Amino acid sequence: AVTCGQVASSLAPCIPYARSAGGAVPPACCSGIKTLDGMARTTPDRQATCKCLKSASTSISGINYGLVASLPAKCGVNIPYKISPSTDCARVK
């Protein structure tokens, strides 16, 4: 299964943008999102990713969750659902 180390390494370039008002996505953040997409191909990998993101969120303030929800589509990755702290990781498919 993908580790929290793997998730952090792929989405670390997204953190400064995740705290901003929006605008142009850093290419390294889109690259990071593509890498994470490539690692999370099973339900458990997506559930692990969800749990790693929620855990890291408790240690970071100033996050623009409305902007984070749309980041995949801005990076060319089509996603059925929005990334949300509200969503239970146990219900991620």
Author numbering: 1 to 93
Q: Would you copy out the relevant sentences from the publication that reported this structure?
A:
Lipid transfer proteins (LTPs), also called non-specific lipid transfer proteins (nsLTPs), are known for their ability to bind and transport hydrophobic ligands. The biological role of nsLTPs is still not well understood. They transport these lipids between biological membranes primarily for defense, including structural adaptation, antimicrobial activity, and pathogenic resistance. We elucidated the crystal structures of Act c 10.0101 and Pun g 1.0101, nsLTP allergens from gold kiwifruit and pomegranate, respectively. These allergens both belong to the subfamily of 9-kDa LTPs.
